[PDB]
Design a protein around this ligand. Sequence first.
Ligand SMILES: *CC(=O)NCC1CCN(C(=O)C2(Nc3ccccc3)CCCCC2)CC1
Ligand SMILES: *CC(=O)NCC1CCN(C(=O)C2(Nc3ccccc3)CCCCC2)CC1
Ligand SMILES: [Mg+2]
Ligand SMILES: [Mg+2]
Ligand SMILES: [Mg+2]
Ligand SMILES: [Mg+2]
Lengths: 236, 236, 5, 5
Amino acid sequence: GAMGSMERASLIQKAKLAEQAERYEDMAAFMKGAVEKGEELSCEERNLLSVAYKNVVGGQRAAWRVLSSIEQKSNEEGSEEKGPEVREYREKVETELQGVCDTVLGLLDSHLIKEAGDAESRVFYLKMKGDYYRYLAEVATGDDKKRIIDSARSAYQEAMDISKKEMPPTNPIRLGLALNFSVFHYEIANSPEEAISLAKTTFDEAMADLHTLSEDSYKDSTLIMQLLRDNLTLWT
Amino acid sequence: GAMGSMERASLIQKAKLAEQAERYEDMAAFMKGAVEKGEELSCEERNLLSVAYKNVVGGQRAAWRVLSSIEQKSNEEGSEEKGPEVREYREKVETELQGVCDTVLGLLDSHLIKEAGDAESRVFYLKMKGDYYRYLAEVATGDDKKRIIDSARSAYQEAMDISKKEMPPTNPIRLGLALNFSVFHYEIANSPEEAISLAKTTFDEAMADLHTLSEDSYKDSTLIMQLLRDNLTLWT
Amino acid sequence: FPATV
Amino acid sequence: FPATV
Ligand SMILES: *CC(=O)NCC1CCN(C(=O)C2(Nc3ccccc3)CCCCC2)CC1
Ligand SMILES: *CC(=O)NCC1CCN(C(=O)C2(Nc3ccccc3)CCCCC2)CC1
Ligand SMILES: [Mg+2]
Ligand SMILES: [Mg+2]
Ligand SMILES: [Mg+2]
Ligand SMILES: [Mg+2]
């Protein structure tokens, strides 16, 4: 890998600089290099990894949706034939997106998850695994679509099981996992009732545990609780 | 080139899709491919080319400024030594920026400018040549900095000479050229008085010709006149 | 589009 | 930063 010659600490330093510069592709490449050093990631480093790839794939997903909408409109009755270009370019973006997802999934499988023994790290990585299978599912149309969906579900479910046993209901990783798994249910699994039930129960159980928190922990937990409420408002 | 196998019309179609998707790197690569077909560009196609590369280099310039500011702060008395990483990463971004500028300048030299005989096309390309030498000048620190600055000035000056002879004072290409050459004077050539004089004279001569215009031409010209006024307000 | 983190 | 087009 192109980052093989760079010190771990320098890759992390540069990831932080890339974030400040809003250079998320560079940030992701630096963090990939850091992961590939083979040492476990600290909490801060896990967050750098996730922020980098979230921003890269987020941009690809937004572009894919624009292109998919244009393509769908082209296939409506009365739309003039404009040739293969819209499909080709949507495919191009799609393939690049799938590549990024495969890269992230590859880092998780080799070997972040297997070395992650603490609840906070293991849940964080399993949530990421669910998220990147969910992004693959968003664009899947073939023989493997059901298996991709099930891979996301399985990763999220393992993360939920650990989170419920090992973390308080206000833990931001637990909350963010539940938020995202709820979206999986609504948008991917055609299970809006499950999505709504999960968001509601997660919100209410967090509410009941806020009294245990410092002001700073309260801020962190309530931010994500508000996202749960925002989704519930969208869905009800 | 990787676009050598794609039809000119398909490259232009895809550039437009990439713009809608805010995929400016792709947009620029498509437009480079289109230029390399060897045919002259229409007005619409020239605008696609410029929008694509403006957005790519604009992002690089913004990142370079963030990194340069961090680097400058690191070299202040009392700043703790953090090693070569900030300089290295600023250099990385800088080199990529220079590459994009060299690519654009290369398209202009081979062979857009020499084939451009109409005032609107020739002024447009010469303005671009000045702009991309100006971006090189922004990051230049070596033996060639003066020659880079002079290359920008020469390109802008040739464009100004043609524009004044061949185009009305409200022509948007003429206005945008003057706006940018004025910024060159202020930011690159250490000539704020020349910058201010140029912006003022350009604004006033345009004002006097607005009466000749349709409503739609008036809209186009006044938008850029307001940018001239905005700069004058910043500088006075 | 719903919120995720 | 000044306006350019
Ligand atoms: C130690 C460890 O693994 N830390 C992750 C932390 C806690 C959660 N956190 C956030 O609250 C935000 N992002 C996020 C939350 C949950 C899971 C994944 C990411 C919440 C949304 C805004 C940005 C921070 C990140 C740091
Ligand atoms: C026919 C040709 O070469 N057309 C260029 C046109 C006219 C000018 N124009 C614009 O007004 C904007 N951009 C721009 C102006 C002048 C020079 C270069 C670019 C003005 C700023 C907002 C975007 C359009 C582009 C199309
Ligand atoms: Mg495909
Ligand atoms: Mg349940
Ligand atoms: Mg250099
Ligand atoms: Mg003069």
